[PDB]
Short mmCIF file of C-alpha atoms and ligand atoms in Angstrom, two decimals:
data_model
loop_
_atom_site.label_atom_id
_atom_site.label_comp_id
_atom_site.label_asym_id
_atom_site.label_seq_id
_atom_site.Cartn_x
_atom_site.Cartn_y
_atom_site.Cartn_z
CA UNK A 8 -53.30 -37.69 29.27
CA UNK A 9 -50.36 -35.13 29.15
CA UNK A 10 -52.20 -32.37 31.05
CA UNK A 11 -54.79 -33.05 33.78
CA UNK A 12 -58.37 -32.27 32.55
CA UNK A 13 -58.95 -30.45 35.85
CA UNK A 14 -58.97 -31.04 39.61
CA UNK A 15 -60.56 -34.58 39.49
CA UNK A 16 -60.06 -37.53 37.09
CA UNK A 17 -61.70 -40.99 36.83
CA UNK A 18 -64.85 -39.65 38.54
CA UNK A 19 -68.35 -41.19 38.31
CA UNK A 20 -69.08 -38.63 35.50
CA UNK A 21 -66.29 -40.51 33.61
CA UNK A 22 -68.06 -43.86 34.11
CA UNK A 23 -69.66 -45.69 31.20
CA UNK A 24 -72.16 -48.52 31.32
CA UNK A 25 -71.79 -51.08 28.52
CA UNK A 26 -74.65 -53.48 27.81
CA UNK A 27 -75.23 -56.48 25.50
CA UNK A 28 -71.76 -57.95 26.10
CA UNK A 29 -71.15 -61.49 24.70
CA UNK A 30 -71.40 -64.42 27.23
CA UNK A 31 -67.69 -65.28 26.87
CA UNK A 32 -66.44 -61.68 27.57
CA UNK A 33 -63.08 -61.36 29.34
CA UNK A 34 -61.60 -58.44 31.32
CA UNK A 35 -58.77 -58.21 28.70
CA UNK A 36 -61.30 -58.05 25.80
CA UNK A 37 -63.41 -55.36 27.61
CA UNK A 38 -60.26 -53.31 28.40
CA UNK A 39 -59.13 -53.71 24.70
CA UNK A 40 -62.54 -52.32 23.59
CA UNK A 41 -61.54 -49.03 25.39
CA UNK A 42 -57.69 -49.10 24.68
CA UNK A 43 -57.66 -45.95 22.52
CA UNK A 44 -59.18 -43.88 25.36
CA UNK A 45 -56.04 -43.93 27.53
CA UNK A 46 -55.35 -45.76 30.80
CA UNK A 47 -58.54 -47.55 32.05
CA UNK A 48 -59.73 -46.77 35.57
CA UNK A 49 -61.88 -49.16 37.68
CA UNK A 50 -63.50 -51.89 35.58
CA UNK A 51 -66.50 -53.93 36.81
CA UNK A 52 -67.90 -56.72 34.61
CA UNK A 53 -71.06 -58.70 35.19
CA UNK A 54 -70.24 -61.58 32.89
CA UNK A 55 -73.42 -63.46 33.95
CA UNK A 56 -75.77 -60.57 33.00
CA UNK A 57 -73.90 -59.20 29.95
CA UNK A 58 -72.92 -55.75 31.19
CA UNK A 59 -69.97 -53.83 32.55
CA UNK A 60 -68.72 -50.48 33.71
CA UNK A 61 -65.48 -48.61 32.95
CA UNK A 62 -64.08 -45.30 34.28
CA UNK A 63 -62.04 -43.31 31.81
CA UNK A 64 -59.66 -40.47 32.81
CA UNK A 65 -61.85 -37.52 31.79
CA UNK A 66 -65.46 -36.70 30.90
CA UNK A 67 -64.33 -35.77 27.34
CA UNK A 68 -62.74 -39.28 26.95
CA UNK A 69 -65.96 -40.95 28.15
CA UNK A 70 -67.99 -38.75 25.72
CA UNK A 71 -65.79 -39.79 22.78
CA UNK A 72 -65.86 -43.54 23.74
CA UNK A 73 -69.65 -43.39 24.08
CA UNK A 74 -70.11 -41.67 20.68
CA UNK A 75 -67.62 -44.04 18.97
CA UNK A 76 -68.61 -47.39 20.62
CA UNK A 77 -72.36 -47.09 21.07
CA UNK A 78 -74.29 -49.39 18.67
CA UNK A 79 -71.13 -51.12 17.32
CA UNK A 80 -70.87 -54.94 16.91
CA UNK A 81 -69.05 -57.36 19.20
CA UNK A 82 -69.48 -61.02 18.07
CA UNK A 83 -72.98 -60.58 16.61
CA UNK A 84 -74.26 -58.22 19.31
CA UNK A 85 -74.78 -54.47 19.12
CA UNK A 86 -73.14 -52.91 22.21
CA UNK A 87 -75.22 -50.41 24.10
CA UNK A 88 -72.89 -47.67 25.55
CA UNK A 89 -74.26 -45.10 28.00
CA UNK A 90 -73.17 -42.79 30.82
CA UNK A 91 -73.48 -44.73 34.08
CA UNK A 92 -76.13 -43.14 36.24
CA UNK A 93 -74.47 -41.36 39.17
CA UNK A 94 -74.54 -43.61 42.27
CA UNK A 95 -73.47 -40.98 44.85
CA UNK A 96 -75.41 -37.83 43.78
CA UNK A 97 -77.71 -35.46 45.63
CA UNK A 98 -80.19 -32.75 44.82
CA UNK A 99 -79.89 -29.51 46.85
CA UNK A 100 -82.44 -26.69 46.96
CA UNK A 101 -83.37 -23.50 48.87
CA UNK A 102 -79.99 -22.09 47.76
CA UNK A 103 -79.35 -18.37 47.94
CA UNK A 104 -78.89 -16.89 44.38
CA UNK A 105 -75.32 -15.89 45.49
CA UNK A 106 -74.14 -19.49 46.11
CA UNK A 107 -71.74 -20.43 43.25
CA UNK A 108 -70.57 -23.90 41.97
CA UNK A 109 -67.32 -23.52 44.01
CA UNK A 110 -69.03 -22.37 47.26
CA UNK A 111 -71.44 -25.35 47.07
CA UNK A 112 -68.50 -27.74 46.41
CA UNK A 113 -66.34 -26.28 49.22
CA UNK A 114 -69.34 -26.45 51.58
CA UNK A 115 -70.20 -30.10 50.79
CA UNK A 116 -66.52 -31.30 50.83
CA UNK A 117 -66.75 -31.50 54.64
CA UNK A 118 -68.95 -34.67 54.33
CA UNK A 119 -66.28 -36.52 52.35
CA UNK A 120 -64.40 -36.51 49.03
CA UNK A 121 -66.42 -34.59 46.41
CA UNK A 122 -66.28 -34.93 42.60
CA UNK A 123 -68.43 -31.97 41.53
CA UNK A 124 -71.11 -29.55 42.73
CA UNK A 125 -73.10 -27.38 40.36
CA UNK A 126 -75.74 -24.64 40.77
CA UNK A 127 -78.43 -25.14 38.13
CA UNK A 128 -78.97 -21.85 36.19
CA UNK A 129 -81.80 -20.68 33.90
CA UNK A 130 -81.34 -19.41 30.25
CA UNK A 131 -80.02 -16.07 31.75
CA UNK A 132 -77.23 -17.67 33.82
CA UNK A 133 -79.11 -16.84 37.06
CA UNK A 134 -79.39 -19.45 39.89
CA UNK A 135 -82.61 -21.44 40.00
CA UNK A 136 -82.03 -21.98 43.76
CA UNK A 137 -81.29 -25.68 43.02
CA UNK A 138 -78.05 -27.54 42.57
CA UNK A 139 -76.42 -30.98 42.30
CA UNK A 140 -73.69 -32.46 44.52
CA UNK A 141 -71.71 -35.51 43.28
CA UNK A 142 -69.56 -37.35 45.83
CA UNK A 143 -66.66 -39.83 45.26
CA UNK A 144 -68.37 -42.44 47.48
CA UNK A 145 -71.86 -43.49 48.57
CA UNK A 146 -71.05 -43.14 52.37
CA UNK A 147 -70.06 -39.44 51.82
CA UNK A 148 -73.42 -38.82 50.04
CA UNK A 149 -75.36 -40.66 52.82
CA UNK A 150 -73.61 -38.57 55.55
CA UNK A 151 -74.35 -35.26 53.61
CA UNK A 152 -77.96 -36.44 53.20
CA UNK A 153 -78.43 -37.45 56.89
CA UNK A 154 -76.63 -34.46 58.45
CA UNK A 155 -78.40 -31.83 56.32
CA UNK A 156 -81.77 -33.48 57.11
CA UNK A 157 -81.14 -33.67 60.90
CA UNK A 158 -79.31 -30.29 61.26
CA UNK A 159 -79.50 -26.79 59.75
CA UNK A 160 -76.77 -26.38 57.07
CA UNK A 161 -76.22 -22.77 56.00
CA UNK A 162 -74.08 -21.60 53.05
CA UNK A 163 -74.29 -17.75 53.22
CA UNK A 164 -75.37 -14.96 55.62
CA UNK A 165 -79.17 -15.11 55.17
CA UNK A 166 -80.40 -18.24 57.03
CA UNK A 167 -81.63 -20.53 54.27
CA UNK A 168 -81.33 -24.20 55.31
CA UNK A 169 -80.05 -26.31 52.41
CA UNK A 170 -82.68 -29.00 51.61
CA UNK A 171 -80.90 -32.18 50.46
CA UNK A 172 -82.93 -34.82 48.54
CA UNK A 173 -82.31 -37.93 46.43
CA UNK A 174 -81.50 -36.91 42.88
CA UNK A 175 -84.34 -37.79 40.43
CA UNK A 176 -82.58 -39.60 37.58
CA UNK A 177 -85.13 -40.13 34.79
CA UNK A 178 -84.34 -41.37 31.25
CA UNK A 179 -84.88 -38.63 28.63
CA UNK A 180 -82.31 -40.21 26.28
CA UNK A 181 -83.74 -43.60 25.22
CA UNK A 182 -87.32 -43.11 26.49
CA UNK A 183 -90.04 -45.55 25.46
CA UNK A 184 -89.23 -46.90 21.97
CA UNK A 185 -91.98 -48.40 19.72
CA UNK A 186 -90.33 -51.89 20.10
CA UNK A 187 -91.45 -52.16 23.79
CA UNK A 188 -94.79 -50.25 23.39
CA UNK A 189 -95.87 -52.91 20.78
CA UNK A 190 -95.64 -55.73 23.43
CA UNK A 191 -98.83 -54.42 25.17
CA UNK A 192 -102.25 -56.08 24.43
CA UNK A 193 -104.29 -52.79 24.78
CA UNK A 194 -101.72 -51.06 22.41
CA UNK A 195 -103.60 -52.29 19.25
CA UNK A 196 -106.91 -50.83 20.50
CA UNK A 197 -105.06 -47.62 21.56
CA UNK A 198 -103.29 -46.94 18.21
CA UNK A 199 -106.63 -47.68 16.36
CA UNK A 200 -107.55 -43.92 16.45
CA UNK A 201 -104.75 -41.71 15.13
CA UNK A 202 -103.59 -38.43 16.72
CA UNK A 203 -106.32 -35.79 16.16
CA UNK A 204 -107.90 -32.60 17.33
CA UNK A 205 -111.17 -33.42 19.09
CA UNK A 206 -114.18 -31.68 17.60
CA UNK A 207 -116.95 -29.62 19.27
CA UNK A 208 -119.91 -31.82 20.30
CA UNK A 209 -118.10 -35.13 20.67
CA UNK A 210 -117.94 -36.93 23.97
CA UNK A 211 -114.06 -36.90 23.81
CA UNK A 212 -114.03 -33.15 23.24
CA UNK A 213 -116.40 -32.53 26.19
CA UNK A 214 -114.61 -34.94 28.51
CA UNK A 215 -111.20 -33.38 27.52
CA UNK A 216 -112.44 -29.80 28.03
CA UNK A 217 -113.76 -30.73 31.54
CA UNK A 218 -110.45 -32.56 32.28
CA UNK A 219 -108.43 -29.46 31.23
CA UNK A 220 -110.64 -27.30 33.52
CA UNK A 221 -109.80 -29.59 36.49
CA UNK A 222 -106.08 -29.44 35.52
CA UNK A 223 -106.23 -25.58 35.38
CA UNK A 224 -107.99 -25.60 38.83
CA UNK A 225 -105.25 -27.95 40.12
CA UNK A 226 -102.52 -25.56 38.86
CA UNK A 227 -104.29 -22.61 40.50
CA UNK A 228 -104.69 -24.55 43.86
CA UNK A 229 -100.96 -25.63 43.71
CA UNK A 230 -99.83 -21.96 43.06
CA UNK A 231 -102.07 -20.81 45.92
CA UNK A 232 -100.50 -23.30 48.36
CA UNK A 233 -97.08 -21.89 47.33
CA UNK A 234 -98.32 -18.32 48.02
CA UNK A 235 -99.97 -19.29 51.34
CA UNK A 236 -96.80 -21.00 52.48
CA UNK A 237 -94.59 -18.12 51.21
CA UNK A 238 -96.61 -15.81 53.55
CA UNK A 239 -96.34 -18.25 56.51
CA UNK A 240 -92.52 -18.42 55.93
CA UNK A 241 -92.37 -14.53 55.82
CA UNK A 242 -94.51 -14.23 58.98
CA UNK A 243 -92.30 -16.87 60.73
CA UNK A 244 -89.20 -14.92 59.75
CA UNK A 245 -90.62 -11.65 61.20
CA UNK A 246 -91.81 -13.25 64.47
CA UNK A 247 -88.44 -15.00 64.96
CA UNK A 248 -86.45 -11.78 64.29
CA UNK A 249 -88.61 -10.12 67.01
CA UNK A 250 -88.22 -13.14 69.40
CA UNK A 251 -84.43 -12.91 69.00
CA UNK A 252 -84.44 -9.01 68.99
CA UNK A 253 -82.38 -9.31 65.77
CA UNK A 254 -82.08 -5.59 65.19
CA UNK A 255 -81.67 -4.69 68.94
CA UNK A 256 -79.12 -4.89 71.80
CA UNK A 257 -80.48 -6.99 74.77
CA UNK A 258 -78.69 -8.79 77.72
CA UNK A 259 -80.91 -11.94 77.76
CA UNK B 12 -80.56 -41.17 9.32
CA UNK B 13 -81.41 -37.38 9.31
CA UNK B 14 -78.12 -35.40 8.87
CA UNK B 15 -76.99 -31.82 9.82
CA UNK B 16 -79.88 -31.20 12.22
CA UNK B 17 -80.11 -28.58 15.00
CA UNK B 18 -78.85 -31.37 17.41
CA UNK B 19 -75.68 -31.51 15.22
CA UNK B 20 -75.09 -27.77 15.77
CA UNK B 21 -72.17 -26.56 17.89
CA UNK B 22 -71.50 -23.06 19.38
CA UNK B 23 -67.74 -22.10 19.55
CA UNK B 24 -66.82 -19.23 21.88
CA UNK B 25 -63.54 -17.43 22.75
CA UNK B 26 -62.45 -17.43 19.07
CA UNK B 27 -59.35 -15.22 18.39
CA UNK B 28 -60.33 -11.63 17.44
CA UNK B 29 -58.91 -12.16 13.86
CA UNK B 30 -60.59 -15.57 13.19
CA UNK B 31 -61.64 -16.19 9.54
CA UNK B 32 -64.27 -18.59 8.10
CA UNK B 33 -61.57 -20.86 6.50
CA UNK B 34 -59.61 -21.04 9.76
CA UNK B 35 -62.89 -21.91 11.65
CA UNK B 36 -63.74 -24.70 9.15
CA UNK B 37 -60.21 -26.14 9.29
CA UNK B 38 -60.62 -26.42 13.07
CA UNK B 39 -63.50 -28.93 12.34
CA UNK B 40 -62.09 -30.64 9.15
CA UNK B 41 -61.43 -33.89 11.13
CA UNK B 42 -65.21 -34.37 11.46
CA UNK B 43 -66.06 -34.66 7.75
CA UNK B 44 -67.97 -32.17 5.56
CA UNK B 45 -69.14 -29.03 7.37
CA UNK B 46 -72.75 -27.93 7.19
CA UNK B 47 -73.90 -24.32 7.60
CA UNK B 48 -71.27 -22.08 9.31
CA UNK B 49 -71.90 -18.60 10.82
CA UNK B 50 -69.43 -16.32 12.65
CA UNK B 51 -70.71 -13.55 14.96
CA UNK B 52 -67.44 -11.54 14.80
CA UNK B 53 -68.94 -8.93 17.17
CA UNK B 54 -69.05 -11.35 20.11
CA UNK B 55 -66.22 -13.71 19.01
CA UNK B 56 -68.37 -16.81 18.62
CA UNK B 57 -69.38 -19.10 15.78
CA UNK B 58 -71.75 -21.93 14.88
CA UNK B 59 -71.25 -25.10 12.85
CA UNK B 60 -73.53 -28.04 11.94
CA UNK B 61 -71.80 -31.38 11.60
CA UNK B 62 -73.08 -34.50 9.77
CA UNK B 63 -74.28 -36.46 12.86
CA UNK B 64 -74.96 -36.08 16.63
CA UNK B 65 -72.05 -38.56 17.30
CA UNK B 66 -69.61 -36.35 15.29
CA UNK B 67 -70.79 -33.13 17.09
CA UNK B 68 -70.35 -34.90 20.50
CA UNK B 69 -66.82 -36.04 19.53
CA UNK B 70 -65.88 -32.53 18.21
CA UNK B 71 -67.27 -30.89 21.38
CA UNK B 72 -65.25 -33.31 23.60
CA UNK B 73 -62.04 -32.95 21.56
CA UNK B 74 -62.20 -29.17 20.98
CA UNK B 75 -63.70 -27.80 24.19
CA UNK B 76 -61.15 -26.02 26.39
CA UNK B 77 -58.33 -26.30 23.84
CA UNK B 78 -56.04 -23.36 23.03
CA UNK B 79 -56.63 -21.29 19.90
CA UNK B 80 -54.15 -18.47 19.47
CA UNK B 81 -54.15 -17.48 23.14
CA UNK B 82 -57.54 -18.36 24.61
CA UNK B 83 -59.31 -21.58 25.49
CA UNK B 84 -62.20 -22.37 23.17
CA UNK B 85 -65.62 -22.84 24.69
CA UNK B 86 -67.46 -25.48 22.67
CA UNK B 87 -71.14 -26.21 23.46
CA UNK B 88 -74.21 -27.66 21.72
CA UNK B 89 -76.15 -24.73 20.23
CA UNK B 90 -79.16 -23.79 22.42
CA UNK B 91 -87.74 -24.60 20.85
CA UNK B 92 -88.81 -27.36 23.29
CA UNK B 93 -92.17 -28.30 24.72
CA UNK B 94 -92.87 -30.31 27.87
CA UNK B 95 -95.83 -32.70 27.18
CA UNK B 96 -97.80 -34.44 29.93
CA UNK B 97 -100.94 -36.55 30.56
CA UNK B 98 -99.55 -39.16 28.11
CA UNK B 99 -101.01 -42.72 28.05
CA UNK B 100 -98.33 -45.33 29.05
CA UNK B 101 -98.92 -46.52 25.38
CA UNK B 102 -97.44 -43.34 23.83
CA UNK B 103 -93.92 -44.18 22.55
CA UNK B 104 -91.18 -41.79 21.26
CA UNK B 105 -92.27 -42.62 17.63
CA UNK B 106 -96.00 -41.87 18.22
CA UNK B 107 -95.05 -38.59 19.91
CA UNK B 108 -92.85 -37.68 16.87
CA UNK B 109 -95.55 -38.67 14.28
CA UNK B 110 -98.23 -36.64 16.15
CA UNK B 111 -96.37 -33.38 16.76
CA UNK B 112 -94.71 -33.32 13.26
CA UNK B 113 -97.83 -31.58 11.82
CA UNK B 114 -96.83 -28.37 13.68
CA UNK B 115 -93.26 -28.22 12.25
CA UNK B 116 -89.97 -30.21 11.89
CA UNK B 117 -89.18 -32.49 14.88
CA UNK B 118 -85.59 -32.28 16.25
CA UNK B 119 -86.34 -35.00 18.84
CA UNK B 120 -89.41 -36.48 20.52
CA UNK B 121 -88.94 -38.61 23.65
CA UNK B 122 -91.24 -40.11 26.30
CA UNK B 123 -89.50 -39.70 29.74
CA UNK B 124 -89.18 -43.11 31.49
CA UNK B 125 -88.12 -44.36 34.96
CA UNK B 126 -85.21 -46.84 35.69
CA UNK B 127 -87.60 -49.82 34.91
CA UNK B 128 -88.34 -48.20 31.52
CA UNK B 129 -91.93 -47.27 32.55
CA UNK B 130 -93.53 -44.11 31.08
CA UNK B 131 -93.74 -41.26 33.56
CA UNK B 132 -96.69 -39.91 31.50
CA UNK B 133 -94.38 -37.05 30.47
CA UNK B 134 -92.41 -36.27 27.36
CA UNK B 135 -90.26 -33.74 25.53
CA UNK B 136 -90.79 -32.51 21.97
CA UNK B 137 -88.08 -30.31 20.35
CA UNK B 138 -88.84 -28.41 17.16
CA UNK B 139 -86.27 -26.92 14.69
CA UNK B 140 -87.45 -23.31 15.57
CA UNK B 141 -89.34 -21.12 18.16
CA UNK B 142 -92.38 -20.31 15.82
CA UNK B 143 -93.05 -24.09 15.19
CA UNK B 144 -93.01 -24.76 19.00
CA UNK B 145 -95.32 -21.71 19.51
CA UNK B 146 -97.70 -23.08 16.81
CA UNK B 147 -97.76 -26.48 18.58
CA UNK B 148 -98.29 -24.90 22.02
CA UNK B 149 -101.12 -22.52 20.85
CA UNK B 150 -103.05 -25.28 18.96
CA UNK B 151 -102.74 -27.77 21.87
CA UNK B 152 -103.70 -25.14 24.50
CA UNK B 153 -106.77 -23.86 22.62
CA UNK B 154 -107.77 -27.19 21.10
CA UNK B 155 -108.02 -30.70 22.44
CA UNK B 156 -105.15 -32.76 20.99
CA UNK B 157 -105.49 -36.55 21.36
CA UNK B 158 -102.91 -39.21 20.63
CA UNK B 159 -104.73 -42.50 21.02
CA UNK B 160 -108.30 -43.96 21.20
CA UNK B 161 -108.66 -43.36 24.98
CA UNK B 162 -109.29 -39.58 25.31
CA UNK B 163 -106.44 -38.01 27.23
CA UNK B 164 -105.79 -34.37 26.25
CA UNK B 165 -102.00 -33.77 25.80
CA UNK B 166 -101.01 -30.94 28.17
CA UNK B 167 -98.34 -28.89 26.49
CA UNK B 168 -96.07 -26.38 28.37
CA UNK B 169 -92.97 -24.50 27.05
CA UNK B 170 -89.85 -26.27 28.41
CA UNK B 171 -87.48 -23.75 30.09
CA UNK B 172 -83.89 -24.67 29.20
CA UNK B 173 -81.81 -25.14 32.39
CA UNK B 174 -77.99 -25.43 32.57
CA UNK B 175 -76.59 -28.13 34.97
CA UNK B 176 -73.20 -28.25 33.15
CA UNK B 177 -71.62 -24.75 33.37
CA UNK B 178 -73.91 -23.75 36.27
CA UNK B 179 -73.01 -20.60 38.22
CA UNK B 180 -69.21 -20.24 38.19
CA UNK B 181 -67.69 -18.05 40.93
CA UNK B 182 -65.94 -15.93 38.19
CA UNK B 183 -69.35 -15.08 36.56
CA UNK B 184 -71.10 -14.18 39.89
CA UNK B 185 -71.66 -10.40 40.01
CA UNK B 186 -69.80 -8.98 43.04
CA UNK B 187 -72.57 -6.46 43.91
CA UNK B 188 -73.79 -5.44 47.47
CA UNK B 189 -76.06 -8.51 47.79
CA UNK B 190 -73.15 -10.84 46.88
CA UNK B 191 -70.94 -9.03 49.46
CA UNK B 192 -73.62 -9.31 52.18
CA UNK B 193 -74.26 -12.99 51.45
CA UNK B 194 -70.59 -13.98 51.31
CA UNK B 195 -69.87 -12.34 54.68
CA UNK B 196 -70.69 -15.57 56.64
CA UNK B 197 -69.18 -18.92 55.56
CA UNK B 198 -70.86 -22.37 55.19
CA UNK B 199 -71.72 -23.83 58.63
CA UNK B 200 -74.11 -25.96 60.69
CA UNK B 201 -76.21 -23.53 62.77
CA UNK B 202 -76.14 -23.93 66.58
CA UNK B 203 -79.20 -24.91 68.62
CA UNK B 204 -80.76 -21.90 70.36
CA UNK B 205 -79.56 -19.30 67.83
CA UNK B 206 -81.96 -17.32 65.65
CA UNK B 207 -80.50 -18.86 62.48
CA UNK B 208 -81.01 -22.41 63.79
CA UNK B 209 -84.45 -21.94 65.42
CA UNK B 210 -85.89 -20.02 62.51
CA UNK B 211 -84.43 -22.51 59.94
CA UNK B 212 -85.86 -25.58 61.77
CA UNK B 213 -89.32 -24.00 61.90
CA UNK B 214 -88.87 -23.04 58.16
CA UNK B 215 -88.12 -26.75 57.39
CA UNK B 216 -91.46 -27.68 59.11
CA UNK B 217 -93.34 -25.15 56.90
CA UNK B 218 -91.47 -26.38 53.82
CA UNK B 219 -92.45 -30.00 54.67
CA UNK B 220 -96.08 -28.82 55.22
CA UNK B 221 -96.11 -27.00 51.79
CA UNK B 222 -95.04 -30.28 50.10
CA UNK B 223 -97.80 -32.22 51.96
CA UNK B 224 -100.43 -29.60 51.00
CA UNK B 225 -99.25 -29.66 47.33
CA UNK B 226 -99.54 -33.47 47.39
CA UNK B 227 -103.06 -33.32 48.89
CA UNK B 228 -104.10 -30.87 46.07
CA UNK B 229 -102.80 -33.39 43.46
CA UNK B 230 -104.54 -36.34 45.26
CA UNK B 231 -107.87 -34.51 45.59
CA UNK B 232 -107.76 -33.42 41.92
CA UNK B 233 -106.64 -36.91 40.73
CA UNK B 234 -109.88 -38.22 42.43
CA UNK B 235 -111.98 -35.48 40.69
CA UNK B 236 -110.29 -36.31 37.35
CA UNK B 237 -110.89 -40.08 37.75
CA UNK B 238 -114.61 -39.68 38.58
CA UNK B 239 -115.03 -37.40 35.48
CA UNK B 240 -115.26 -40.32 32.98
CA UNK B 241 -118.30 -41.90 34.70
CA UNK B 242 -120.02 -38.49 35.39
CA UNK B 243 -119.54 -37.46 31.72
CA UNK B 244 -120.74 -40.86 30.40
CA UNK B 245 -123.94 -40.43 32.48
CA UNK B 246 -124.58 -36.76 31.53
CA UNK B 247 -123.43 -36.53 27.89
CA UNK B 248 -126.01 -35.67 25.27
CA UNK B 249 -125.74 -34.62 21.61
CA UNK B 250 -126.66 -31.08 20.51
CA UNK B 251 -129.88 -32.25 18.84
CA UNK B 252 -130.95 -34.46 21.81
CA UNK B 253 -133.37 -31.97 23.50
CA UNK B 254 -134.89 -29.37 21.11
CA UNK B 255 -138.13 -27.39 21.26
ZN1 LIG C 323 -122.15 -26.41 21.21
#
């Protein structure tokens, strides 16, 4: 806590979700659970449903608390500690490859207080044309979402409207454990045949080979649509440049 | 359970030019017994495997961006993954692990779920090395790999690793002629009646149309895929069924 971790502290990236809390949990007890991770930020406890949230000062402190407190006992119950899913986050796409984390953040700060913006890069450190914008409040995210949908928001010279969408937040951490899968009645009949390579001549081999052929055809039709629409977007660009005499002087 | 795995491996960048192996280990002594250590002195970075994922996460959070004889260390998880789809909603993380383990050691196998904990029909399988992941991909592409009784071929694709943490920092952006051209005009809302507005709004319409057309392709092929079971049941015959 001596030196600031950066520009913003106690952000939603610093928020932890804590599940399986005992029924008699108190705010003091919950705060004491996190006492070694510095001064607590906002605390929200759902005593009736056994869960709470806490904001720590930095992402590193939340990472340590999560690693140290996850799956530890509290009065006969194993606490479940996880990063709280971001409640005020947006997906952005159609970005120029020359938009940086800082340009995206500066650009989106006009909609309200911003925590972070990032341009998603591939293994080479090159822009994928997609990014993430994390706001300090849900209204700021709603306004960014509405305004960029209704208007044309441009970040650089080349006119590329930023396309703002809800951020897909899927669980690739816990997934579907065997404990829940077992609760299904058709599960027993499903696990009856072990993983295998289907063999030539069998119905399952023939069905699977035809299925794969349809999937390959679907991939080819999807890639074609992309190409077809890439050409319509290039033709639109050319017609509009001519309509607006983009390379030429003209009074009207 | 399984200790010193590839998920326990940390990359440490911005090491002082005169770093030694004993100095590098001492940096991580807080986190128990070190596993395999390697220092690429040429590029000023090193690797270390710690006992557990929890310990590697703590060491990354405590050591990242901390001074070491003049520079700030860059600590990251060390960067062999396959995307798997067409999974039954019955396939669990454990079944996925059991099944793909025949191709090589499994770092992690997870079924991707939604906020209700429902299978998306997609998963991720991470192997300890690139040849094991290639082996799994080749075998599942060529052959028909099945996980359960109901025949659903697992569709395996190599998972491109994307970075949503470091991203594209302004300092790292190459300041070439395209960067200069792009940065000439600042962020703005375009004005109605300008080329940049009128073109962009019509582009949005084509972009929305592309998404609709993509969705229709998926819907039309989902229908073809669903009818396939009944068509195949009607037409299937064994190799010896009709011989002269
Ligand atoms: Zn044959």
